[PDB]
Symmetry: D2
């Protein structure tokens, strides 16, 4: 029989609100969208503002103010709650703050009876995916993090503007930690079928500009925060696409926070890191295994070791 | 010869940014979006955040930070700049400040050689539309204000929730000044082909409940501002829809800020007010005229007299 | 847990194939589409042609050759099987022949354990909807026919071309039999908020031009059959919208083949006929009832009495 | 100022009508669609059938029956007119017949004053693209053929079913003549960024399976023709995607009938053949030049030799 697909959103700030907006505009069958925030006034205001535009939507959608009661029968739970760049300094203190919040949130969600899929966006996304997995006891393939999807989006925009080519034809990935230790898969990048190495040999692009594009990908968050306070639109679209791919059972490969256990180096094991995986109706279907050049394998290993280091502390 | 369609957005606040985001998601052929703001940092940050999500869009779109000089060959100019009102404030009050702002903006735009269509969202929207028309000396059919489209969307959502029927089947308008003096076309309202009067007879809705819905429509702005600082999602969708109807040459009737000079009894003439008009590629094709209940006509004339009072102060 | 929505198409002719194509293009999430035809080569070929274009679709979709075995776990069964009307042949001339086909189809379907929703398009659509309900022994809310949705689309196109106004703003229905006994709700018709009587008064349209539009609606099928043998595009879109409205649980009012037993004066009861009804996740939520002019009521009763003259012979 | 975009379709058969249907459903702002056919009755019937479903479309669009005089101000001309291969008809016979038909069509069109873009689909599509360019005298960049876009779509569907992965991650081309002398770019294929080589090593696929996939791609046309008479859905979607890429100025790379004179070793020059090119508002912006394995270059040169000989005959 036909069912009502339910998505609960925990965290009604810039990122969560942007995701909800984009989802109401472009919906792949999300019958009910439930919004939860510790600041209940903000959640109620967002629910009202999103409902007031139903007349302009292609489809109608039930946007509801919610409590954790609502997670019992939910099909997806999207977490965007946290302290976006808090004041005390230190990203280890950030991890502590946000994992403290996640303890509470996850306990409430699991005590509700929820048995769907987690989609995690709160920073540091990889560590918070790990924390969600452990605090919840869910299977690893029911816990997803956005990982390097936003970094990959930025990378592909930079390459599209460089070559003046639709992002549709830009086949490159950012992998590793969603942060400063990320790396681009330069050696495996293609523009449509044309390898990047041919573009280098023909002089359209140089290794210098590749270094600069990567530095740009890494500095984009800081640039945008300086310019406008926060970043939410691109990540909102990424979250929306993950959700639509899940509910669409599209078997699509995405650069998400993936749990690796031998893939790539046979060295990196037992953590969530930015990597390509198949997404479908049940969550993660497969963590893809492919060879990366030695340079990029060393970068991957260093990134995973940085992640292990930050986990160890707490 | 195929053309590149250009929209210049002036005012990169909540409303303008929401409209730009929605437009990038649901794009009816806008090839170039130029974002202007007296706060250059905010415009640049919004441009970067909007471009970093191209990968997730149906179609790539060129988004630019620009300056008034870009209005020269622009096809549409959307103005969302000004003061946005806060607790204990109204819309009919930010009139002299916002009119000065519009003087400056319009002078710059027209000086650049622009000759396209103005789409005005800033408040008080009817008054600012009249101001745009007279400062620009453009044809009146090239000046569109958003009018009562947001009020109408809210009304239709409330009626949809009451009857649990898709908004598509809700045929009702809010008319008059976008604000406190507005009214609903209760006596002309239908659910599909079923008159609202029949629902009243059947006891499925009450007169008191209609008055409740109208008070909710009028107080929605104050509610949502109290709850989350400002409204911007619904109005962003409405602006997106107006822009797409223009570029698409869709000949669609919308309740916008329309110039009346004889319609609805001709008691009040030569002002912009919330009323239905046909929108097309060239701007406003017609401002329609239909008979409304006598009580509703009295309400309409009261609203128009308030507006004309504020305008005659000049 | 999330679900795979399944639609089984029975009848891979022009109408069925148009519906399948349109659905693959504009897919409110059918994860699986099965195509059944007594001419199995035709079904195989259609399946292949539909799958060969997956690269150009927004979303992938599994299109399968199947048999009645596939109806067991089907969420929706669309029936487009039957006999086309030949030149000089009315829809009702098919009653006998097609009735026999349905007896077989409905038999097999019911034997597989299907307990979803029927969407009936084969002609004469109202009588075939009644026959489906009687053979299947299903609840009346689980059997839907397209009724006068196609005639209504035609009426709205003709009015949109007369007034040069988007079909969005054309609020008029064709009701009664999907055939030569249909009528238009001229007295209840409105263009946005503006009644049709006001256009008549202003001379923007004449009574005789309304009669001409009705005659054109009635004779559209015969004209198109003469010109190219059969119609399938418009009805393809109509069925597609019905299906997406069901799966989307959109609670949308549509002029479908609705079961009446007391509505519209109760002078004829216990038939299916073209009338407005709410569509949602599990079929028909409610068959509406509104008051229509006495002449229109005489026409409605004539049509209903014709349809019952046929149903009584059964 | 804003322009109306005009597409003129010559040939209202299966392919042209499917393209028109798909375009009305998924419309990147074609304001006017004009359908021309020597068989006036068929064109009129299709115009009526497409118009009768406007109420179900996301956007309204003026679909009109017309004559060659309408090409004067057309922005795109899509030619689907001509015969398809029959049993015992070689590419040579089809070339003869369809080149005569194109003589007629191109003469009429150019006499009308048309100065837009040609999109060619009649078979053999590479030769007919060359012939359109030669007869019209238009620039090379203003004459586009569908090339191997359909064979590429079929290839990617087959790989998507085999690897059970979204077509959106299947990076592989069919190149050469749109026919039996086509070949797959096996040695440059990647799923996401896992080379097909790696899939072969692990036994996930075999060489015989690749040969059978290429055989299926080459035989699909005959199979579907035997099964249901003709193919037209997939190529309809392909033509629609090309038209929307054009009007959208999307700068997208597609495997179309591209004019080569140096690329791929430059052994054969001055022909249209299935190859990747950037599509934009002005037509073909650039014909790309990635380089391929020795096997595949031998195949490509054989195919180009075929085409060039058939051309030199004339
Ligand atoms: N139905 C409607 O039409 C509605 C109208 N609204 C009004 O829209 C306007 C914008 O609202 P918000 O975005 O929420 O407020 P906001 O402060 O977040 O944004 C206003 C923007 O305008 C900028 N600005 C000011 N002057 C100029 C100038 N001369 N040139 C360029 N930019 C300038 C300013 O820097 C700011 O970024 C306000 O007047 C609102 O009252 C808001 C809600 C709905
Ligand atoms: N509701 C509406 O508005 C309209 C109703 N239409 C009717 O829809 C029906 C189909 O029309 P067309 O597609 O043009 O005709 P068609 O000949 O092209 O296709 C009908 C299909 O039904 C097949 N069929 C017959 N019996 C069975 C069976 N037991 N199981 C499976 N398949 C079977 C048959 O092989 C054929 O392929 C006709 O009855 C039309 O009169 C057509 C147009 C619009
Ligand atoms: N994964 C990515 O690519 C990426 C992109 C941008 C930033 N982020 C991060 O994700 C989060 C997004 O934050 P933001 O930009 O929306 O800032 P924000 O402050 O506007 O939103 C954070 C929300 O979390 C709420 N919250 C706090 N504790 C809560 C609790 N126990 N339960 C429910 N809600 C609670 C807060 O009330 C607030 O509304 C941050 O951690 C941010 O650093 C993710
Ligand atoms: N990937 C591809 O390129 C591909 C795929 C399928 C078939 N085709 C080809 O497209 C063309 C149409 O295929 P079809 O299946 O629709 O066959 P069809 O017979 O159904 O349609 C051809 C149309 O062209 C019309 N026509 C003939 N001569 C004309 C003239 N001088 N002026 C105007 N119109 C004329 C005919 O009236 C007919 O309607 C064929 O050449 C076919 O081989 C393209
Ligand atoms: Ca550039
Ligand atoms: Ca309710
Ligand atoms: Ca007209
Ligand atoms: Ca006339
Ligand atoms: Ca498979």
């Amino acid at each position: 029989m036909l069912k009502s697909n339910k998505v609960v959103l925990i965290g009604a700030g810039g990122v969560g609100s942007s995701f909800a907006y984009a989802l109401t505009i472009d919906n792949s069958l999300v019958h009910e969208l439930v919004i939860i925030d510790v600041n209940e006034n903000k959640a109620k205001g967002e629910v009202m503002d999103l409902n007031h535009g139903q007349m302009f939507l292609k489809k109608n959608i039930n946007v509801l103010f919610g409590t954790y009661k609502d997670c019992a029968n939910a099909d997806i739970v999207v977490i965007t709650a946290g302290l976006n760049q808090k004041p005390g300094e230190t990203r280890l203190d950030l991890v502590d703050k946000n994992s403290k919040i996640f303890k509470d949130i996850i306990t409430n969600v699991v005590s509700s009876g929820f048995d769907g899929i987690f989609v995690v966006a709160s920073n540091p996304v990889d560590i918070m995916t790990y924390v969600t997995m452990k605090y919840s006891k869910f299977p690893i393939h029911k816990v997803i993090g956005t990982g390097t999807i936003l970094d990959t989006s930025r990378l592909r925009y930079f390459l599209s503007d460089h070559f003046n080519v639709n992002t549709q034809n830009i086949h490159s990935y950012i992998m590793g930690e969603h942060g400063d230790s990320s790396f681009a898969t330069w050696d495996e990048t293609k523009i449509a079928m044309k390898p990047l190495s041919e573009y280098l040999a023909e002089g359209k692009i140089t290794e210098l500009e590749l270094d600069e594009i990567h530095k740009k990908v890494v500095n984009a968050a800081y640039e945008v925060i300086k310019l406008k306070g926060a970043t939410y639109y691109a990540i909102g679209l990424g979250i929306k696409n993950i959700v639509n791919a899940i509910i669409g059972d599209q078997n699509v490969i995405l650069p998400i926070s993936s749990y690796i256990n031998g893939q790539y180096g046979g060295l990196i094991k037992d953590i969530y890191i930015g990597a390509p995986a198949i997404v479908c109706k049940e969550g993660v279907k497969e963590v893809l295994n492919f060879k990366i050049s030695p340079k990029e394998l060393d970068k991957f290993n260093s990134s995973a070791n940085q992640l292990k280091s930050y986990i160890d502390k707490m």
